[PDB]
Short mmCIF file of N, CA and C in Angstrom, two decimals:
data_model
loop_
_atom_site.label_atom_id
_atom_site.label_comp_id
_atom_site.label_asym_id
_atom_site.label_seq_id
_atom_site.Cartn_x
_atom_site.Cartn_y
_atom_site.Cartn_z
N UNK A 6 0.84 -1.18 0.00
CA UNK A 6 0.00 0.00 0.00
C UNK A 6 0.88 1.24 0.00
N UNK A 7 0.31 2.43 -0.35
CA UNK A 7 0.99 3.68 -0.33
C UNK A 7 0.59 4.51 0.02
N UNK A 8 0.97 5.53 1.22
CA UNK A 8 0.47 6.71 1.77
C UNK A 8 0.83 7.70 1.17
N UNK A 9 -0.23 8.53 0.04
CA UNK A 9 0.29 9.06 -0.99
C UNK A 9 -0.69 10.04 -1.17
N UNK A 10 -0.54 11.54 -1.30
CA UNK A 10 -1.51 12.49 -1.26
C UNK A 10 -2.00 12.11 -2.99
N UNK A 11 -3.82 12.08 -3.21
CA UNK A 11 -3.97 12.54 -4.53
C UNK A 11 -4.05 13.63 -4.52
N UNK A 12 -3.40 14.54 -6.02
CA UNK A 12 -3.92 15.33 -6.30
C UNK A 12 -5.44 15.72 -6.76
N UNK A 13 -6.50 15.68 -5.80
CA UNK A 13 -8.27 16.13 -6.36
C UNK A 13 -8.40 17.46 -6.87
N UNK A 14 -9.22 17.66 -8.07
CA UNK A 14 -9.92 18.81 -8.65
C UNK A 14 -11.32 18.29 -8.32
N UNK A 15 -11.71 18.84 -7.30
CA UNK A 15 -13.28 19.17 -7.18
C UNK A 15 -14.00 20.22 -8.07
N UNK A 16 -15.01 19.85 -8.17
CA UNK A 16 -16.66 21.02 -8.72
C UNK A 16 -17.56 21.43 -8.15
N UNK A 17 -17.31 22.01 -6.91
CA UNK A 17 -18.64 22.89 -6.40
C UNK A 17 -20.28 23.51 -7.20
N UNK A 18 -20.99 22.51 -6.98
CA UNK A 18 -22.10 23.17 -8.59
C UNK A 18 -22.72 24.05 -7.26
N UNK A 19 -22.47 24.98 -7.60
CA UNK A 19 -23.44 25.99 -6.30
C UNK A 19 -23.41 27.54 -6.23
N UNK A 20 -24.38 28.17 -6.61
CA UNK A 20 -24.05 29.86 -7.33
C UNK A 20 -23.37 30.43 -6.43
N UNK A 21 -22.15 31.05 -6.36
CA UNK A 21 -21.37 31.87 -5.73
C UNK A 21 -20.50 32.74 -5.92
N UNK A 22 -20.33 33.72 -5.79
CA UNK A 22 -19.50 34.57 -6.37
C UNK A 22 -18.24 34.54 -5.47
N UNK A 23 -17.23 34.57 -6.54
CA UNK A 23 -15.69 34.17 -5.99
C UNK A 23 -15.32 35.26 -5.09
N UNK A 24 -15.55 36.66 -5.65
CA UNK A 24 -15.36 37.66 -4.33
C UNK A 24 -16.33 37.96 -3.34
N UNK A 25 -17.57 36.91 -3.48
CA UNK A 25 -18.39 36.78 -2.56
C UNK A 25 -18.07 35.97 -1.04
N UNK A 26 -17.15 35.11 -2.11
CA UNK A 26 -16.46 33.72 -1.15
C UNK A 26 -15.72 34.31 -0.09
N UNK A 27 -14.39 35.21 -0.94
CA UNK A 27 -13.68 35.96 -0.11
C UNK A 27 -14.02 36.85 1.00
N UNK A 28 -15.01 37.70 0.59
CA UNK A 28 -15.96 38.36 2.24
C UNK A 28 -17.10 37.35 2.52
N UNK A 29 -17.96 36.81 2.22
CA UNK A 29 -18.96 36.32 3.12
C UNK A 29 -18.39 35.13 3.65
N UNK A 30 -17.59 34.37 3.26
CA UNK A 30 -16.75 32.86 3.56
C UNK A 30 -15.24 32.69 3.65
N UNK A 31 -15.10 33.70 3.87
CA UNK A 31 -13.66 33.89 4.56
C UNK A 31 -13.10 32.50 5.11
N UNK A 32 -13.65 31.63 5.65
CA UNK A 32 -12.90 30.39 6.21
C UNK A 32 -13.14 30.06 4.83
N UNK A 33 -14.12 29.36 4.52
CA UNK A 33 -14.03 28.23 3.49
C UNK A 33 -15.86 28.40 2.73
N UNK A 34 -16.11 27.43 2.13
CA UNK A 34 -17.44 26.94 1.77
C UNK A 34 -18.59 26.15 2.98
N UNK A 35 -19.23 27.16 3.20
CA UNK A 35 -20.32 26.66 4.04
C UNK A 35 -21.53 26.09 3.87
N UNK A 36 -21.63 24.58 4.43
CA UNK A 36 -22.79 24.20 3.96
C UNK A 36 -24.21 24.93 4.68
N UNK A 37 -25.47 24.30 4.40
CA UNK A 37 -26.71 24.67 4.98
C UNK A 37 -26.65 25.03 7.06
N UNK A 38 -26.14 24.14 7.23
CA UNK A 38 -25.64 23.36 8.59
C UNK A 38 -24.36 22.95 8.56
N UNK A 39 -23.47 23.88 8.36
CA UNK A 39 -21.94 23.45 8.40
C UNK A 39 -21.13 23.22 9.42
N UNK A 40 -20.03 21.86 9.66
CA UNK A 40 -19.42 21.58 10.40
C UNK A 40 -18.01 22.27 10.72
N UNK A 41 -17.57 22.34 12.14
CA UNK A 41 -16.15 22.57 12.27
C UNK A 41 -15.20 21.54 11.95
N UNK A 42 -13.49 21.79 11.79
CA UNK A 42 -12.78 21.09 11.48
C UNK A 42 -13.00 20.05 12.37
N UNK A 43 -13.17 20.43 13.99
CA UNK A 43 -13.28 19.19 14.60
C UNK A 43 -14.66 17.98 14.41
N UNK A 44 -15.20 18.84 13.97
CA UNK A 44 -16.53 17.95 14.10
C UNK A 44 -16.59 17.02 12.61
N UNK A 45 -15.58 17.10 11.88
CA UNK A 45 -14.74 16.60 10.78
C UNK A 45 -14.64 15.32 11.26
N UNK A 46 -13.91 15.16 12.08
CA UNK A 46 -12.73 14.25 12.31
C UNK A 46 -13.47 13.24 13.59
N UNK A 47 -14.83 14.31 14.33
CA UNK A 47 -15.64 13.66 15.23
C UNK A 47 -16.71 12.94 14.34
N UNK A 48 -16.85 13.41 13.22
CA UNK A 48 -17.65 12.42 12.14
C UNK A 48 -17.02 11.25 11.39
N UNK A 49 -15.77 11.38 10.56
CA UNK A 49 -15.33 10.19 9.96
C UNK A 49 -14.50 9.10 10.84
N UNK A 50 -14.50 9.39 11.99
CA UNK A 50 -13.74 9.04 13.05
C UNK A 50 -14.81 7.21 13.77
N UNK A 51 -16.05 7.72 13.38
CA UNK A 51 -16.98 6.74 13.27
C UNK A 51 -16.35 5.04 12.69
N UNK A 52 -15.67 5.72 11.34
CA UNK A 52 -15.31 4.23 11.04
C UNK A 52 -14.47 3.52 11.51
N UNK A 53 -13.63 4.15 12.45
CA UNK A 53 -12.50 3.14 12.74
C UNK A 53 -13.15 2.77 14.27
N UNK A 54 -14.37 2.84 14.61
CA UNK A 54 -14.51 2.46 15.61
C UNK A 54 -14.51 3.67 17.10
N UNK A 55 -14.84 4.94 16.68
CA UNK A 55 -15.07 5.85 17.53
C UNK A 55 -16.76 6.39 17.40
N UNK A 56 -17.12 7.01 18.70
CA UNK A 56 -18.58 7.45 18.90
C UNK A 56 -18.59 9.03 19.28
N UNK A 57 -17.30 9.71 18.87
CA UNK A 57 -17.40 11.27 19.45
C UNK A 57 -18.09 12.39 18.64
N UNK A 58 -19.21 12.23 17.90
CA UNK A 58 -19.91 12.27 16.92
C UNK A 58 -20.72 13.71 18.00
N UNK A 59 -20.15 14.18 18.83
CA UNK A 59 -20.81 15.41 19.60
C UNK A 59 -20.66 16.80 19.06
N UNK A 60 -22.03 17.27 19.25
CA UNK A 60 -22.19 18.78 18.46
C UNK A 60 -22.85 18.80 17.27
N UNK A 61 -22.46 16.99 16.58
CA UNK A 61 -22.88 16.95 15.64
C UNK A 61 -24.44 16.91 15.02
N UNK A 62 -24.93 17.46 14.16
CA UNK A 62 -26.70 17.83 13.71
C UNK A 62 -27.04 16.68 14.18
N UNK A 63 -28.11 16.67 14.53
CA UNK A 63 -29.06 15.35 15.07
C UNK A 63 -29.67 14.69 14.06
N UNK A 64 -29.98 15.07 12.88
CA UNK A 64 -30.29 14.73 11.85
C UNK A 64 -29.19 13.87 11.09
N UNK A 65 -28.03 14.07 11.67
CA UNK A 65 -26.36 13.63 11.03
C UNK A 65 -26.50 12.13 11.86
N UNK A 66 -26.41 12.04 13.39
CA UNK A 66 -26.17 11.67 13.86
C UNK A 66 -26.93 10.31 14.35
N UNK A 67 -28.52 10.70 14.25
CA UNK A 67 -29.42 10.27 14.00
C UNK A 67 -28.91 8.91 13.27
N UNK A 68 -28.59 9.09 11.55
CA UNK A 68 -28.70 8.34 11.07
C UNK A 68 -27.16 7.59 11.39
N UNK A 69 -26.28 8.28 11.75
CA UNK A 69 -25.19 7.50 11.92
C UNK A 69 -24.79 6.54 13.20
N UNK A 70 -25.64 6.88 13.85
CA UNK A 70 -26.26 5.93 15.30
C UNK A 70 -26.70 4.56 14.85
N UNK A 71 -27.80 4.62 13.71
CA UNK A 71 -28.78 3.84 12.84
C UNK A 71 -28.03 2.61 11.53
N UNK A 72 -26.41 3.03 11.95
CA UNK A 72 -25.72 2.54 10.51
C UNK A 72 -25.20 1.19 11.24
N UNK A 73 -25.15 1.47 13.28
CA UNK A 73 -24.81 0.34 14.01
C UNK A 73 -23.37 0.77 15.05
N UNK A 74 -22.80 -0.14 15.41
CA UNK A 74 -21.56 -0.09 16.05
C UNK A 74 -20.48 0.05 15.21
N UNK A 75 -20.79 -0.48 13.78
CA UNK A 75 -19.73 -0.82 12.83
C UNK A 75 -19.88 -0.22 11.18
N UNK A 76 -19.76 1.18 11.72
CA UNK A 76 -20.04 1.94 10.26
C UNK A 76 -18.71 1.84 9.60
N UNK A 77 -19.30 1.91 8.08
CA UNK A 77 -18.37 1.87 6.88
C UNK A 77 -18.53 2.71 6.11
N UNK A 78 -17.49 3.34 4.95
CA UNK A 78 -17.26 4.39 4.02
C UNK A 78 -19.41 4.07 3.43
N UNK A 79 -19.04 3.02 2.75
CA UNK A 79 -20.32 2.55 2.16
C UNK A 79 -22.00 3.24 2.75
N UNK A 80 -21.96 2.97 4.23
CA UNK A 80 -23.12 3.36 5.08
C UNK A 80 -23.31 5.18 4.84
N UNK A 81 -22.10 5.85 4.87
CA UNK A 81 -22.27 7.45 4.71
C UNK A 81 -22.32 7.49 3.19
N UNK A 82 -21.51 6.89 2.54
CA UNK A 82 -21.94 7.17 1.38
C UNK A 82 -23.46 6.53 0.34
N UNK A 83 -24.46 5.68 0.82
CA UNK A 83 -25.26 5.75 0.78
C UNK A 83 -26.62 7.19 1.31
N UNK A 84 -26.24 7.23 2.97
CA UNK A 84 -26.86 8.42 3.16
C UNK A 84 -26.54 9.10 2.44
N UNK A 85 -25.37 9.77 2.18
CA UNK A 85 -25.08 11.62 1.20
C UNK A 85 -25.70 10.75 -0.14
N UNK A 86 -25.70 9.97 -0.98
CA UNK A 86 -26.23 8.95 -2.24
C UNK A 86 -27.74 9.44 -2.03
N UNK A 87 -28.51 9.38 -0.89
CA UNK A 87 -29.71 9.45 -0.69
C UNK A 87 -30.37 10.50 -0.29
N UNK A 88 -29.41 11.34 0.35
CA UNK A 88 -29.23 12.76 0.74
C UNK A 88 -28.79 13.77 0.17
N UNK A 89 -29.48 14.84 -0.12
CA UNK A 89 -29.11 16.26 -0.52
C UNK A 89 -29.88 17.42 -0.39
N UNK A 90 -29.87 17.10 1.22
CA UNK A 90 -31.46 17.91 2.07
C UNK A 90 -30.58 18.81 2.57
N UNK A 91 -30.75 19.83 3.79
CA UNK A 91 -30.83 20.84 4.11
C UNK A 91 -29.82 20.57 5.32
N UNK A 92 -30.44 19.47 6.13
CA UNK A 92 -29.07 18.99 7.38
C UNK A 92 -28.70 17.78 6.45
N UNK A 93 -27.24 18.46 5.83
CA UNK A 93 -26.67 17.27 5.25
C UNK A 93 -25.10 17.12 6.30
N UNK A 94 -25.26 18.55 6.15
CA UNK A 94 -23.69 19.09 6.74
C UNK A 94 -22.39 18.83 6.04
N UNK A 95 -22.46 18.08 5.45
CA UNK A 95 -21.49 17.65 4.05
C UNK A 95 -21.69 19.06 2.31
N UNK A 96 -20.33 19.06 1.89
CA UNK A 96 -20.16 19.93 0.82
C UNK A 96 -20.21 18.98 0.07
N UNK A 97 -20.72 18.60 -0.63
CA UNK A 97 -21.18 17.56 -2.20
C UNK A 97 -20.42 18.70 -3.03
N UNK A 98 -19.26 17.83 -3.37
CA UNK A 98 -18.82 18.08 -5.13
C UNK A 98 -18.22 16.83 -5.86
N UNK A 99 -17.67 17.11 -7.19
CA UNK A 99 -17.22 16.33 -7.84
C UNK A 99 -15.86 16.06 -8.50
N UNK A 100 -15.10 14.89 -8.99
CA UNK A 100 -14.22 14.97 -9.53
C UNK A 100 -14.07 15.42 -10.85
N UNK A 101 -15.17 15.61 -11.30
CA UNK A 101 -15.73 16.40 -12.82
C UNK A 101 -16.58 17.38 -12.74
N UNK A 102 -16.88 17.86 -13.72
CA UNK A 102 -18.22 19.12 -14.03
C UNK A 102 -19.17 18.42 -14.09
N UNK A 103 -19.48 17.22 -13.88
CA UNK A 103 -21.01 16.34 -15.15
C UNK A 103 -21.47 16.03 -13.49
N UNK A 104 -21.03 15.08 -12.58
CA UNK A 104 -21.78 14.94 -11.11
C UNK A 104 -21.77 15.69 -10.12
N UNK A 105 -21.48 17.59 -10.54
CA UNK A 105 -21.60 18.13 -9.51
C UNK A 105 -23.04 18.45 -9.29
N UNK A 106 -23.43 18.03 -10.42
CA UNK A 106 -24.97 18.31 -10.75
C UNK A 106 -25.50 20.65 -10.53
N UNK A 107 -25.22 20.72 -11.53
CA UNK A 107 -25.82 22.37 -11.89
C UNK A 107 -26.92 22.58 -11.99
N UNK A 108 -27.64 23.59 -10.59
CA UNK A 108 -28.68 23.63 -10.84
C UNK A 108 -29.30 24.95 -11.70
N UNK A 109 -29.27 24.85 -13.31
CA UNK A 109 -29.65 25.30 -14.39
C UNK A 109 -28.48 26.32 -14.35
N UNK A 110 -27.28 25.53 -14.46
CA UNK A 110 -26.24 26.25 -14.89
C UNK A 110 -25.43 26.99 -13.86
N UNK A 111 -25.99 26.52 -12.80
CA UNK A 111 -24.71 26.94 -11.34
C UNK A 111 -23.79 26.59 -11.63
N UNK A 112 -23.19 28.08 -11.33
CA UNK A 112 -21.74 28.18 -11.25
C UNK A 112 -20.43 27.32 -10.73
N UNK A 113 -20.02 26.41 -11.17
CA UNK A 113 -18.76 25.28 -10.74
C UNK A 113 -17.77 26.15 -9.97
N UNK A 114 -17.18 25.64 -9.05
CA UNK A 114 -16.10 26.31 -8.38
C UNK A 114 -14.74 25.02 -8.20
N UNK A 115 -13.57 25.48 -8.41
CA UNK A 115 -12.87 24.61 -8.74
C UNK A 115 -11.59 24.11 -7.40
N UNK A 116 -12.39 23.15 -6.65
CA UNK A 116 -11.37 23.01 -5.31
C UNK A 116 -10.56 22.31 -5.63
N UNK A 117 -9.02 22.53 -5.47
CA UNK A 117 -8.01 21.84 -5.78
C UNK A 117 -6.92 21.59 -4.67
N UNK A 118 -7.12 20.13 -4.19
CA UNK A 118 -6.17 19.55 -2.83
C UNK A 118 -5.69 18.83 -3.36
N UNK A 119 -4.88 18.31 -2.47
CA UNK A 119 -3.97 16.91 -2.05
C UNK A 119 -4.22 16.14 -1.08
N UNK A 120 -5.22 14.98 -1.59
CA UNK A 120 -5.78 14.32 -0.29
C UNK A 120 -5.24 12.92 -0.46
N UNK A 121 -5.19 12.15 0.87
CA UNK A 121 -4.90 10.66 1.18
C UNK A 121 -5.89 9.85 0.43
N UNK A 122 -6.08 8.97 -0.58
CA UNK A 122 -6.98 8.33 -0.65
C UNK A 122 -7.20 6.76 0.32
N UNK A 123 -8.33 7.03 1.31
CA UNK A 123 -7.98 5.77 2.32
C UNK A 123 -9.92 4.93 2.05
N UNK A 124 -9.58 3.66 2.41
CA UNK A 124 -10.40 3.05 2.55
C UNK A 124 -10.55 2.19 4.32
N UNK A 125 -11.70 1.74 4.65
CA UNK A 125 -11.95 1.19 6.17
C UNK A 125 -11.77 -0.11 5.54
N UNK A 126 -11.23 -1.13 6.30
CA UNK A 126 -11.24 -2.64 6.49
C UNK A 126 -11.30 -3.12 7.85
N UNK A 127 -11.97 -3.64 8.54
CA UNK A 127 -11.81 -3.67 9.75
C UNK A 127 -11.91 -2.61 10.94
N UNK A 128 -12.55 -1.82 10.78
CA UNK A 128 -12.60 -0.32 10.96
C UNK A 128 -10.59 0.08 10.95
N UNK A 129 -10.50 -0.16 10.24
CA UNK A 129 -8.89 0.40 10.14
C UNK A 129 -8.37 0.93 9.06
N UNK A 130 -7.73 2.63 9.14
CA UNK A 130 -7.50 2.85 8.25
C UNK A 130 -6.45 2.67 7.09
N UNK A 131 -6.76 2.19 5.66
CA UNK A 131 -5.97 1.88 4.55
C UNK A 131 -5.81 2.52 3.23
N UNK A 132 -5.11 3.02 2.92
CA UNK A 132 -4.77 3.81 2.00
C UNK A 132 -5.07 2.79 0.71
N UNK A 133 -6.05 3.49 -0.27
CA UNK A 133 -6.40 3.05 -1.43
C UNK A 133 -5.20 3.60 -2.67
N UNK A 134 -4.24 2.67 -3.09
CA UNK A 134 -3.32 3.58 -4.19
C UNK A 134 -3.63 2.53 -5.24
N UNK A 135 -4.61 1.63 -5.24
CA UNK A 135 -4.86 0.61 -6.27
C UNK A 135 -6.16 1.09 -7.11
N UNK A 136 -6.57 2.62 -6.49
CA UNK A 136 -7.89 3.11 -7.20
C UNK A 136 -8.73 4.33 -6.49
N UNK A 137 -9.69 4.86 -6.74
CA UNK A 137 -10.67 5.15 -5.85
C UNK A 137 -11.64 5.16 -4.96
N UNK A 138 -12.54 4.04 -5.86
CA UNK A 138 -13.16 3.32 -4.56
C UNK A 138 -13.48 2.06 -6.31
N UNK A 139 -14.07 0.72 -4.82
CA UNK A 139 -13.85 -0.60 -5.37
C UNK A 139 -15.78 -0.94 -4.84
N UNK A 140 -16.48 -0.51 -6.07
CA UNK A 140 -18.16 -0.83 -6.24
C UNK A 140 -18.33 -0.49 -4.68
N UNK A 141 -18.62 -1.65 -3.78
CA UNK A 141 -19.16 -1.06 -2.50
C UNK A 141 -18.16 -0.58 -1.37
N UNK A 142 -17.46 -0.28 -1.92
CA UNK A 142 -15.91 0.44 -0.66
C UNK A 142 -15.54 1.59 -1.48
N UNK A 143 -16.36 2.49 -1.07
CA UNK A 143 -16.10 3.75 -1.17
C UNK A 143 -14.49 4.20 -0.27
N UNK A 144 -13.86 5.78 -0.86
CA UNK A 144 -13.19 6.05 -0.32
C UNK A 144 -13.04 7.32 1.11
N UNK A 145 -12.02 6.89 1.62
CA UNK A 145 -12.34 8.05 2.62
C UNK A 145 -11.16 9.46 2.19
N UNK A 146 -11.28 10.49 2.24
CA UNK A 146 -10.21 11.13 1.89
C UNK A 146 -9.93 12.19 3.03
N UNK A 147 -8.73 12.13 3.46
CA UNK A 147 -7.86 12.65 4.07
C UNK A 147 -6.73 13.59 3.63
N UNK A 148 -6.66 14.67 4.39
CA UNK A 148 -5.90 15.79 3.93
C UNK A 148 -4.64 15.03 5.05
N UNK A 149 -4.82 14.41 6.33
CA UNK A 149 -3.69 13.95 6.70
C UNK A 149 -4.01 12.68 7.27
N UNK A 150 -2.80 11.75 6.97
CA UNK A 150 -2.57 10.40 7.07
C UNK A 150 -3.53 9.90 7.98
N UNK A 151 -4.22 10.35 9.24
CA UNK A 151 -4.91 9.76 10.38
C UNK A 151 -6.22 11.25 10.62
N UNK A 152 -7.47 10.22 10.52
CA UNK A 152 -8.61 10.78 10.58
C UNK A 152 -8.59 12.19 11.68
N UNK A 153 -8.10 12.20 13.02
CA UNK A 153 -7.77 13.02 13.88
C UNK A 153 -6.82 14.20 14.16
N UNK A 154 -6.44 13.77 12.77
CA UNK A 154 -5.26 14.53 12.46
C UNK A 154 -5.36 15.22 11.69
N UNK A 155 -6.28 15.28 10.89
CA UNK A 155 -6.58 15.93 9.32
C UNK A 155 -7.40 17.33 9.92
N UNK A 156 -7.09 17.86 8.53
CA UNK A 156 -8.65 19.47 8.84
C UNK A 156 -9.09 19.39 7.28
N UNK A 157 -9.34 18.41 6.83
CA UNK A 157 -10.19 18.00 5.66
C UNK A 157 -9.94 16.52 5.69
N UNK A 158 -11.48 16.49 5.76
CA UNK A 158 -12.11 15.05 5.59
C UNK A 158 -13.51 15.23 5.02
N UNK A 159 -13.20 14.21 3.67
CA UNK A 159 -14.38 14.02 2.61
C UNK A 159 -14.59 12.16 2.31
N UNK A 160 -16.05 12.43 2.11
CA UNK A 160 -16.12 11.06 1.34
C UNK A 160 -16.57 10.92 0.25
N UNK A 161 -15.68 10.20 -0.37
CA UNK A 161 -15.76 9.88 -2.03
C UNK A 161 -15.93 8.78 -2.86
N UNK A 162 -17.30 8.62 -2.92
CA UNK A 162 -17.80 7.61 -3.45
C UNK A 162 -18.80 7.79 -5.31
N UNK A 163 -18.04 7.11 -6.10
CA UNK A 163 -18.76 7.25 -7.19
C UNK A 163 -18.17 5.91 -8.16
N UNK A 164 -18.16 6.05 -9.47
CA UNK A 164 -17.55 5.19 -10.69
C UNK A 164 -16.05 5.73 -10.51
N UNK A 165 -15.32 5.39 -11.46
CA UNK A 165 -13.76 5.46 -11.52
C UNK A 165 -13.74 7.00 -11.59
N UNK A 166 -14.41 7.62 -12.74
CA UNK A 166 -14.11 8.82 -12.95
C UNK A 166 -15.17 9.53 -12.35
N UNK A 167 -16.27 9.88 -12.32
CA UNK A 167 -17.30 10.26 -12.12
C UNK A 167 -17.80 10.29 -10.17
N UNK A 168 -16.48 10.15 -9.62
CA UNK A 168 -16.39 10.13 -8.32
C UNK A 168 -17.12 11.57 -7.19
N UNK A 169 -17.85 11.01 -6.72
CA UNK A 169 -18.34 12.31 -6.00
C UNK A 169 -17.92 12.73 -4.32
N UNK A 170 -17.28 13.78 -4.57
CA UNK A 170 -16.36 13.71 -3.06
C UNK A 170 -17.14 14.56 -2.01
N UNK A 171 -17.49 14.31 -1.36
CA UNK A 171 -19.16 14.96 -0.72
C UNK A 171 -18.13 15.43 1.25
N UNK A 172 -17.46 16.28 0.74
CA UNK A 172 -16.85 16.95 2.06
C UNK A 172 -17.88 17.13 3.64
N UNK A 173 -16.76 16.15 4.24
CA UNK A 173 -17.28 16.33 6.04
C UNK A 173 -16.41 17.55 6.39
N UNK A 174 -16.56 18.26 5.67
CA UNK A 174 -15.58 19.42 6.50
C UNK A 174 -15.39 20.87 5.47
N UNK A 175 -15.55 22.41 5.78
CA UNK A 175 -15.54 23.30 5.65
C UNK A 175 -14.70 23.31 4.83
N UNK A 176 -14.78 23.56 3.48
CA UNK A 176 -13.66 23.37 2.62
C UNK A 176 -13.27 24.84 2.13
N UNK A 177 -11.49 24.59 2.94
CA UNK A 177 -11.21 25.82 2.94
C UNK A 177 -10.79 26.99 1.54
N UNK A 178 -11.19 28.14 2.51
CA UNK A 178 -10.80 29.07 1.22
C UNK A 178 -9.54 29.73 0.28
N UNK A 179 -8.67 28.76 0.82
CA UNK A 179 -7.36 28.74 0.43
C UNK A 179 -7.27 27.81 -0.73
N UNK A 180 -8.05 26.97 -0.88
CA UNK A 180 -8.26 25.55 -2.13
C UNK A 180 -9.04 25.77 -3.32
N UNK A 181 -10.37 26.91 -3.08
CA UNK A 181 -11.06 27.16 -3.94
C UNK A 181 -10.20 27.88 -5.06
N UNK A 182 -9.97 27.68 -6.32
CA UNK A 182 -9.77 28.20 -7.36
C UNK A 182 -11.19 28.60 -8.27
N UNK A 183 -10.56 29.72 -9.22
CA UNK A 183 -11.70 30.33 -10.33
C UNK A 183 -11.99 29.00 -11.39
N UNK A 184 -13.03 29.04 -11.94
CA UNK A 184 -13.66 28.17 -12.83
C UNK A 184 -14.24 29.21 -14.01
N UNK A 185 -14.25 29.05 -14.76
CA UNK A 185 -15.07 29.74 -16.28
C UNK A 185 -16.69 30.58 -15.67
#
């Protein structure tokens, strides 16, 4: 295996103006119900076998209570799959323009990191360098090597290319680049 940052180009499909970003969102991209960095790491932290899921929307938590003792990439990425309500608390974008889904031509915004691509086995974390995600093992992505450690954490679950990286975490305004 290899602990190896990908380079991701995300697609924000969501009307915003770039010098809007800069004064009204000064940290980063805010969802409806947006999470802190910690509450990042108190959410994906679930899979390896943690419950510090505090602060977090009840509506979040709710269902992640509901996934069992033994949640997997798969279980959140079904909810956000099934979800794109109001308490999502997750930033839904894409590795392309085509699944950020535009609503009638919203504006794409172009986030560009370097994230870990990791997958859960055992609630333990494993770095995926053989792909993105594998049909029902979605990936987890990490800005640093260990879930607790990171201040970006997304999950990214889609086809090879067509991957949709649906951010547990305030995606900062230092990453957003201009788009057309």
């Amino acid at each position: 295996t290899n602990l190896q940052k990908k380079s991701f180009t995300l697609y924000r499909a969501d009307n915003r103006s770039f010098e809007e970003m800069q004064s009204k969102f000064p940290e980063g991209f805010k969802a409806w119900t947006p999470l802190d960095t910690k509450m990042a790491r108190q959410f994906a932290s679930i899979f390896i076998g943690q419950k510090d899921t505090s602060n977090l929307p009840k509506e979040t938590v709710k269902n992640i209570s509901t996934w069992g003792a033994k949640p997997k990439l798969k279980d959140l990425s079904n909810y956000i799959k099934y979800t794109k309500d109001k308490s999502t608390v997750w930033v839904s974008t894409a590795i392309n323009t085509e699944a950020g889904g535009q609503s009638s031509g919203a504006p794409l915004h172009k986030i560009d990191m370097d994230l870990y691509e990791f997958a859960i086995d055992g609630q333990k974390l494993n770095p995926l360098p053989e792909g993105r995600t594998k049909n029902m093992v979605p990936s987890l992505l990490l800005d640093t090597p260990q879930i607790e450690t990171s201040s970006i954490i997304a999950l990214n679950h889609g086809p090879v290319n067509d991957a949709e990286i649906s951010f547990l975490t305030t995606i900062p305004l230092k990453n957003v680049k201009p788009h057309k």
